[PDB]
From a paper:
Upon completion of the single screw turn, the first and last dimers (1/1* and 6/6*) encounter each other at a slightly larger angle of 70° (top view, left) and laterally displaced (side view, right); they cannot form the same inter-dimer contacts as dimers can form within the screw turn; the steric clash between dimers 1/1* and 6/6* terminates oligomerization. Hhal2243 consists of a PIN-like metallonuclease domain into which two helices are inserted that we termed the ‘spike-helix’ (SH) domain. Two Hhal2243 monomers align head-to-head with their SH domains consisting of helices α5 and α6 to form a dimer, while two SH domains form a four-helix bundle resulting in six spikes that protrude from the dodecameric assembly. The covered interface between neighboring dimers extends over 900 Å2 and involves the long α4–α5 loop of one monomer and the α7–α8 loop as well as helix α8 of the respective other monomer.
Ribonuclease P (RNase P) is the essential endonuclease that catalyzes the 5’-end maturation of tRNAs. More recently, a bacterial protein-only RNase P, associated with a single polypeptide as small as ~23 kDa, was discovered in the hyperthermophilic bacterium Aquifex aeolicus that lost the genes for the RNA and protein subunits (rnpB and rnpA) of the classical and ancient bacterial RNase P. This prokaryotic type of minimal RNase P system was named HARP (for: Homolog of Aquifex RNase P) and identified in 5 other of the 36 bacterial phyla beyond Aquificae. HARPs belong to the PIN domain-like superfamily of metallonucleases.
Residue numbers in the entry:
A (entry chain L), C (entry chain A): 2 to 98, 131 to 189
B (entry chain K), D (entry chain B), E (entry chain C), F (entry chain D), G (entry chain E), H (entry chain F), ...: 1 to 98, 131 to 189
J (entry chain J): 1 to 102, 125 to 189
Amino acid sequence: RRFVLDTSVFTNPDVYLRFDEEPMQAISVFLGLARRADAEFYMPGPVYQELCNLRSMDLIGAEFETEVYIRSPRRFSMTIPSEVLYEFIEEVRTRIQEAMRRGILDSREDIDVVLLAYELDATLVSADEGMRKFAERIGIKLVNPRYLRGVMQNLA
Amino acid sequence: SRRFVLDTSVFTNPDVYLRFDEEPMQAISVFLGLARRADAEFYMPGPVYQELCNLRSMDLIGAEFETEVYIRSPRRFSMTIPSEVLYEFIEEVRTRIQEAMRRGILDSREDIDVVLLAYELDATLVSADEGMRKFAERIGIKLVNPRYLRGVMQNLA
Amino acid sequence: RRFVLDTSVFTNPDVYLRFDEEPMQAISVFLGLARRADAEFYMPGPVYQELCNLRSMDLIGAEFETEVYIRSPRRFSMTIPSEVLYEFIEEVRTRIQEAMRRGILDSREDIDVVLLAYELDATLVSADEGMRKFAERIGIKLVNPRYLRGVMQNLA
Amino acid sequence: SRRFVLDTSVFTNPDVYLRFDEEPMQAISVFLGLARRADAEFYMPGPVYQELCNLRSMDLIGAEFETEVYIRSPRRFSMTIPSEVLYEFIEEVRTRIQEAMRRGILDSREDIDVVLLAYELDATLVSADEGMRKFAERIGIKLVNPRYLRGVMQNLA
Amino acid sequence: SRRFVLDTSVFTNPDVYLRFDEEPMQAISVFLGLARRADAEFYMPGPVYQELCNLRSMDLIGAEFETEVYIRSPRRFSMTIPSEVLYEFIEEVRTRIQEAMRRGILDSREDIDVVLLAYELDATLVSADEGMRKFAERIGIKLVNPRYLRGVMQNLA
Amino acid sequence: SRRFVLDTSVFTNPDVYLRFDEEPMQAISVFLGLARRADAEFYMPGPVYQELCNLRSMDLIGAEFETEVYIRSPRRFSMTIPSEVLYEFIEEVRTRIQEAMRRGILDSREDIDVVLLAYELDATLVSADEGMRKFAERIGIKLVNPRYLRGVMQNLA
Amino acid sequence: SRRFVLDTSVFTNPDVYLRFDEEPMQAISVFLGLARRADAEFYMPGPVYQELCNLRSMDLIGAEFETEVYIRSPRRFSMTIPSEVLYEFIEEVRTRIQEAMRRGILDSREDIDVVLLAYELDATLVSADEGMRKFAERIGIKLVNPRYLRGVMQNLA
Amino acid sequence: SRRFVLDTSVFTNPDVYLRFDEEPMQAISVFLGLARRADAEFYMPGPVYQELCNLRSMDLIGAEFETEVYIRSPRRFSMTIPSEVLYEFIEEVRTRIQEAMRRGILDSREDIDVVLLAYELDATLVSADEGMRKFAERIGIKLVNPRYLRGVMQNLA
Amino acid sequence: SRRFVLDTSVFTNPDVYLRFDEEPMQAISVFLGLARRADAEFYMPGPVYQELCNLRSMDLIGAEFETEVYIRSPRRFSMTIPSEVLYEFIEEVRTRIQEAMRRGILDSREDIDVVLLAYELDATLVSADEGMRKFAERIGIKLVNPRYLRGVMQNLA
Amino acid sequence: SRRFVLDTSVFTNPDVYLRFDEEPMQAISVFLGLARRADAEFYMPGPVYQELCNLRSMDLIGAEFETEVYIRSPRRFSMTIPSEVLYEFIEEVRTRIQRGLRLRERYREAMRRGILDSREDIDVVLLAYELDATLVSADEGMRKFAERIGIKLVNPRYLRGVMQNLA
Amino acid sequence: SRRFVLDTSVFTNPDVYLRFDEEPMQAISVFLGLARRADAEFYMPGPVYQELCNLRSMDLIGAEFETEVYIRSPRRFSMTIPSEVLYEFIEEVRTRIQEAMRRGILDSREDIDVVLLAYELDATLVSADEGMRKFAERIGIKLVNPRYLRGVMQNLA
Amino acid sequence: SRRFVLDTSVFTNPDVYLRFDEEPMQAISVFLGLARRADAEFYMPGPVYQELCNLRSMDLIGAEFETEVYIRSPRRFSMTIPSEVLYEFIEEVRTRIQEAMRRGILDSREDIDVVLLAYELDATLVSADEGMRKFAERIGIKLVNPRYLRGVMQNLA
């Protein structure tokens, strides 16, 4: 059982919430659910750099890197149906909403994560819903990160 | 039979529009005359053709143009493309940052149509778009500088 | 590419429609759109039988089996994750709606088609929304029954 | 170190409840005494314990009941049971149909809880339900005729 | 391509044997004609062929039959059937009761050869035995109602 | 450690139980006495158990006979026997020709569970049935002549 | 296309080179003529070819023979026969007791080459040996009766 | 643990026989004393045990012998030997060209049971048959010079 | 039809290039004449063609040249080179040192485009970089001595 | 199990060399002590080991070192790197020659070391590629290369805290 | 089509090479004459071609030579021989005990080039080196007795 | 756990011979003592062990030696070495030039026994031959310096 995390897991309210009240204590409680769960959690490297730019520090980072595999996808030898590209175009549209940089980098981050999930045949988890629609049309299992903590529980 | 994939740049953008005719309708007609004589199969994505009709073409143009230029859908479904083609698409959009935004993104959509059609048929892409040129050069699609396209019509018998 | 069909594709409107106004010629134009493409269509045995008794007869059925493989899912020697069953539980909930036999049998053919798609790793098609959400939770490539023609065109 | 998985029917349904005692608290307490003297480990699904506490159990005794019996939920995620199981689920669903259908569905849900915990731990299932006993025999769970459950408790020293 | 596995019923039992021709051997020859013009391969296991050749097929037709129908017995080995398949097969021997036990067991042997062949090749079983057809359906064998068999070969060309 | 799969023939066949003791009920009792002291585990299929219960079993023995014998069915669901086994089973029906044919067919089911159970556990099969022991020897099951069963129980201490 | 695995019996058995012309070498020649117009590919394991040269064939036809008959030995290493074959193979060597024993061993090696080639290619085997055909019919090789070989190369052009 | 596989030779051929004890039966008895104190599991193919029990064993020793010797034939099915083995095998039967022929073949079947069992368990093949030792060394089986077998159970204990 | 893959050294390096002609434009022209008459196809990576266009080529010949020589760069994405190539590749960067920092990387980018394109198309590499020819021979690319290139075109009709 | 692929930088570059202990060899020793208890398996290719031995490690640690560090070279043969890697590799090799420069033999020698690092680094990265293992190294160039190719990464700053918290 | 893999012996050793023509260089030239008119394509490894080039081959034929004899070396990566080949190969070096030892190892490298190329392409190795042909039969390469090679190309036309 | 493929040099060459003890037999015995206390399994190919047994080992040491050092030969068949291993192996024999070439050939055979065994098992090949170490490094075998071997078995208890 393999899971593919996303930055929204530790950023989106009611997803960050329902984990814990404090940010770093929320990551710590996720860590506590991990290190005991039978599953393994992957997180693409750019997402890790994004998160570490916000709040992560050495003490919490040690646990986080022990429990979450920091891995970018096997960039190549992975082959997507043409669907994705055309489909992905629409995603970019929905992310126009100073805007261009963050929107395009966010879309690249989205594709990076969903590609990792597709490669590993793992379950992507992410709060953002356009990501969900894309990932279901490309063919990846999704778990609502609100219920992800419910999943780590009962999986320990 | 040496298959070509026609991007609409050859019918609009200058420096490749010229050397065919001074007049756009006669440039299209003379390109048509060079077609059906050279041992070639010209392909064009459907949206490109309909836009061309809305851009400049009229019905007398379009009838003969369809009769000789194969307007074919780029197998938009179940085509097995390699991964980073999407990342080159993102890098293109990053370079295509510049009502205006919608035109940019939809132009990107059409250009991707053309490139994917060429990739699928392995045909030779002809295009004036330099960014599309680098993207197609990296993806692995046969390229032609379209300033030679008329120069390719004859010399192709 | 591989697809897994279901009776809704030929019974429920919104996929009954836009194929053809006449039902038998709707199936026939679906047949003609196939018989040319590169995709393979499967249909579990009971599903096909329920379809056949009702509307499809000797005039069209020969063609139907010339293009569509009738195969019950390889029930035996296959494993599904346990949580599926509560998923199925909840599906039975959504089918509580005389109706006892209809609901139980419909869930029966539901799992027939779902497991066939899971084994073949194909792209399920079905009009019923509950089955669509079930497939999303289990992790099946699922496409809209109306999008199915739009896929057939651009394949033939 | 023999492992046992209990059931609602063990305590609540008579005909297996009897041969322990007639006053329910006395029988549950003598069951507590019989266990933890034997070399057995007892498991009981969590929600099943909660519903039992809703039926008869009181907080006076549960402390020792939670010392000897493990109130554990099944590893219901990441557990990969044979797919066909669900098929006879539906078969079983039929044999449980008889607004009472919601009660039947709750019964089915709890029965699956117990059976899946036993399949996870490979323990000896105990349950008075011939419906659940047949299912456990088919899927491959160790069984015990629960009328001999006390007769099992002794000889387990 | 598409693969078919045949049974002696296809060439012995009318109502699939008709729809080809009234006179039997000519119906065999007509099926020979329809195959080799279709885009499918046809397999038919060893013992079944021995039985059918004992019955009606003669030296004249045998040449074409072996030209287009691979007389091959299933891989006999290296094929791991699901365990309960055996149990299911028992049920057939349960229902095949009808001094004719030699015939009964030989029929069971030919039927299991045919079904296992259709299992190994993942081919399409065609047969008039309703008992075998339900077994093949439940195990997961691709099926074709033989009353449509001729109709299939026209639609493949 | 050491696992044994019984047959109800062991407690039923006249020749082998008497070595436990002259009284068949006392034979079962002394078998239980030898068990519970050996380092071995005893499994028995549900069908074989209930066929035995149709012979002699009552509560007095039944308690301990079910404590130190796991009445467990093979994991019929989700196990992969090899194909030739099925073919072999056919020839057993050739030996099981034995009015009585119905019983013979039921024989298969109960009998097959034993073998399957062993195959699943890689256990040690005990059965006075010559046909069963031949089938097990072909299929690859650990075997022990039941005439020595007592001694094998005796030495485990 | 279609692949045949010949055998030295096809040219050394009076039964099989009849149905070609009586002159046996010229029967080989007409066999070659039927090939090169058939849509098949005809293999013959190398030792079998050496045997055929030792007995009967020679240069003048030999050139054409090698043109159209891929003299290829089975890819012994990196091929996995299921183990039962070996016990099966024992049968053959047994019934190949029959100057006497060394010839039996050598023939057994030639026959195992032929059968393994037809097994590896999933080809069709032809041979006049009843033993070879029985062994192939068990292990799962395609068969074509060598009496009907001429008619099989015709209808195959 | 560590698993040995015994050929009957270790109880027949002196120097791997007398080293335990000069008399046959006390030799077997002291071997059984060494085992069941060693930390190894000892295996013997069924036919080997039949062959021995037809030579010397009597119901006295048989108890302990079947206590600490898993009598197990190879899982012939669901085991895929590599092809070239078979040719290997023939050479061994080749060497047995030397009544004797039928005995030679039966010995070959027993020997191949021993070797395939050792291959399947990846156990340690102990046997005095130098031909068997060479064959198993080539195929890749663990080996113990049976002259040291006694020592190997004084250790491991 | 053969596919040839051209390296810019074919036109630059006079040693290969004098035999077409002594003046570079006329030599390109005679090469163009030789092509379009051969049944072969000629390929050139886009970067290599650009580096050519910088040196001597101009618009006059370009068209005709670009009609006959397909300008395409290797499909970098969706290609799986083997690992030792990469280590081999370092050796090239090793020797490409000696105008200093960037010339070597330019050389290696063009060279690896060419070699990988030949690998992808399974075409025939024509080049004068003796190091590149050794590298292509090792990796497994076809080779034509460029000294003979003119002949190899004349002989292709 | 979890699998780590070391790089010699871990045992030469400070700020991962420290954070274990002060003394060099005793820093190696404390790293080993954190290993041999951790659930992970530590790989470190052959030539990397040779050079590390030539830098600091001597025989007094060697027994322990080879006890819990699988000195294994990448299975070069029978491994297929996707094509673009070779181009990507270019740019990484493109950078190292610039940091070699940015007096004749003085800048000449740095190029030699860069292009030999270009071989040791490729062994390490390919081992991590093949095993699907986690790559730890201080070379930001290697880290960015592995980020692009898709190797499991771990900051060597946390390496101690990774073998701690790993039993 | 019918791929052949040549060898230096085919053009050096007599008795195989006169059959084209007695005068050596013209014998090679008429070999090329037969080629280019056959429906066969002739590979030849790089080292072997260069070894031929040192001895006799000259400039005029060279052109025509590379017209049809594809000079390609075995893919040598991502090709997985079966392990026994290595041991097999040892004996060849053994038989090449026969300066001379360096010559022996160089010849062994060239021969492994040829045999591996034929193994990879599944082409038909042709070579007069008797040891090489025995090795090729064992490993499983097609073969064509080179004494017939001239014939093998005529009527292959 | 942690598998070590030993080698004859481990018990023949000082500096891995001497680090356990001074005299040969006592060094073997103390190595044997260190093993059986390590958590590591120690294989040794059959031919290598027979070579050692030729050199020094006798009954007294041999019993223990075979108790704890598995004497297993590589599973030659069904192992797929990648191609250039063979080519790599080539120059190893080159470097083994050193009447006397027979020793080099046999050394090569046993060395490939050891290295292949380690490759198959994915063990930690210990060896003193620096050529073997280099070859095993390039191919991708684990390694530990035999100079440290004693220490490695300690620190591992």
